[model samples]
Target chain A: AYAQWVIIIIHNVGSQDVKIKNLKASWGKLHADGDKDAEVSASNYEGKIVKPDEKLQINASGRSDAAEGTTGTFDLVDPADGDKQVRHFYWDSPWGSKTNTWTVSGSNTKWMIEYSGQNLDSGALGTITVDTLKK
Target chain B: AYAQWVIIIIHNVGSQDVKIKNLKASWGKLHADGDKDAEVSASNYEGKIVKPDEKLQINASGRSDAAEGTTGTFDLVDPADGDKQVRHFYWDSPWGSKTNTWTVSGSNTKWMIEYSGQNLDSGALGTITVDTLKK
Candidate 1:
């Protein structure tokens, strides 16, 4: 519907021999910030490998836990509606019909990792930000 | 009780094949800037279908909207019907935060569309980056 809390925790560091999961992996934000619900998800630690530096938390529901904390955080609410909460995201949008959410993904932050697979190692497809989970 | 809209959404982490939309219809944004709202969020992406190395883009909303390039625009207001949806439906981030979350693991980031309705067919599940159709 329109309820976001903001999430993007992904951290694999690089080359565990690659094995990433969920379509491969995904997460993206910026262009002001906010817009990314479609697919390209899965790697919230899926199957597990994250070798290199090791770190995973990318759970906007794409599940990828492990950030129990060298750091921590990952809310981005959407617990399934019944008056579910956390959805106010605007920054800029005085228009209409902006598919691909306004396009421009490729290593950004506030939330990033906008693409994956290749066993993921375009530098490992590792590294990301934006948090609030585990409250 | 109607009159106002904006949208941008996406999903699909990787499995090979991406063309996205109402261009067969086409597809775009896994975060370069986008999402699916929850499911069928944008009129079930009136863009239609593609997905085997497919990609689409929308750029129109700015304040400079920069984070390196692309990941712009937003509006997704339809918690049942508010219609500000630019479009990018397709989500399957699964769920996480725990379950050992991501044990002492390693990754190859490859699970390839094992589920998530195969991301609605056609096949653009390849790779991503539509950042406003960058060059």
Candidate 2:
């Protein structure tokens, strides 16, 4: 089906820390079943830090602005096959800058934060746990 | 503030690839602004792969069903300070299973995904670019 509105959630449950910067996403495909304009707003969450076991959220609303009383979609990932809808998020780490990508699918997914060593300053891959989460 | 309804979107717009497995999140704090019970749903996105510059979305709605006409919330991350709201997602990478955390805040944030090398198969933390987005 089509998502009328959408939200993005990020949680850090690992021993390693993560620092957030910016998010780049779209309204996906849209449909208008009403005569109202769609609206979107996100938390002023730029440059925040998520310690271990913490979380954050960003929101985007999509209500048909064409006619009010609408049955429209404001999706981040289109459920339709071949639609190939997608989004992007960026962050910083002790190992340097790192990027993670999420594709279109229909199941809960997580990129488990782990370390080659016991902490963030050990082996060639170094550091699995840290006391401070950088920004 | 509380979210009456919610949706989750995950986008992968980086050079590295990511494999998703599961997601753990909550409905945030709730309100009874109407007479309807809140509802939630997510895509079956587990085990899927997101290549560089792709995206995905998950949906969760929070309309009060207690009395209908409800203006309640179904948030992933609480907007209230000290609320300590959080959510989690898990995935796989060349570095092994990694975890990224997001904490409560009021701004759009992204954990910029960078690399120590330029592909997923390099020295130390080599390889930043790859043609195959694993599953």
Candidate 3:
């Protein structure tokens, strides 16, 4: 089993507040055996908005191909919905009552990987970062 | 909307080969709000074995409490099975024909975290490593 850890940091270095349309990390090579692409991503949450000067930190870890872990922490410097960070995390309130929509996973051995995404509101695409610490 | 990446490294320093009976990483604090525990672990590999002098690496990443990514790689110097590293990965063969049983996940905001596990065969418990990088 391969064991390693990584951190993907994204700073909203833009003018207006933006919503993440799609965000993902993927293997650069085909699963030499499985014949499938390996990837993990943030899903759902079309209403959540990231204000200017805010930072989102996604932390994760895992032991095997089938198991992985992730959590999100936001630096809400200026949120659209008052003081609560979770309020801006969803389209509605009572935040904790709603399930989060974050996920990261992979099911193949890869030597090269890429991480990148786009924002819904601004149509802004984040730059792709490549890492060779592939399993 | 937190985004970050991490890697967990494990080295088998003992003399005898051991099987990972249970492996897990968890949040150290109560979900000040959610009232739940967050954790991710390897599952359903009762047949998999880790031999001495061999290294097992578990790599992972994630964005929100709902999603995370992980993959495992092994340095097979002396696996129980011959040539093929996967042959020794399960009680059965046709390696890829069998579904991998790995999964990592979590759902809580924490400030402290811990990683630890025990080997089924050797009854050896891994040392717990603490990290304040909680999110």
Which parts of model 1 have CA positions greater than 4 angstroms off? A1-4, A16-55, A58-135, B1-18, B23-135
Candidate 3 fraction of reference contacts recovered: 0.00
CAPRI docking class of candidate 2: incorrect
lDDT of 1 by residue, B17-90 (tens): 33333311112222222222211232443334334344433211111222111112222122222232323332
Taking all chains together, each candidate's TM-score versus the true structure is: 0.22, 0.24, 0.20
lDDT of 3 by residue, A20-134 (tens): 4333322111111111223233443223465547644332222233322222322222233342221112111011222223223333242223333211111001111212222
lDDT of 3 by residue, B15-132 (tens): 5453443333331111111112233344533234655455444322222442322123222222332322211111111111222232223332422223322111110011111122
Candidate 3 residue spans exceeding 4 A from truth: A1-135, B24-41, B44-47, B63-135
RMSD of each: 19.3, 21.8, 19.9
In lDDT terms, which candidate is top?
Answer: 2
> Number of clashes in model 3?
37
Give a tens-digit lDDT track for model 2, residues A3-82. 12222344455554444443433432222212113333222443455666775543332332311111111122212233
lDDT score, residue B81, model 3? Answer: 28
Per-residue lDDT tens digits for candidate 2, residues B80-126, read 23322222322112122112122222232422322111111111221
Query: Candidates' DockQ values?
Result: 0.03, 0.03, 0.02
